[PDB]
């Protein structure tokens, strides 16, 4: 029943820390920019 064995829920600040967690996804997106970047290839069948 004691706190000390973790059966309360998890801080509000804990959950917090997921949604940086989400934030490093937001870099994979910038990883899909660098795909628009190949684009700048010439039209020509290479």
């Known amino acids: 029943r004691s706190l000390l064995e973790g059966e309360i829920p998890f801080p509000p600040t804990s ?14 997106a910038a990883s899909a920019l660098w795909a628009a970047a190949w ?8």
């Open 15 to 28: 959950i917090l820390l997921l949604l940086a967690c989400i934030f490093l996804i937001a870099i994979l």
């Open 39 to 46: 684009h700048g290839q010439k039209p020509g069948t290479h």
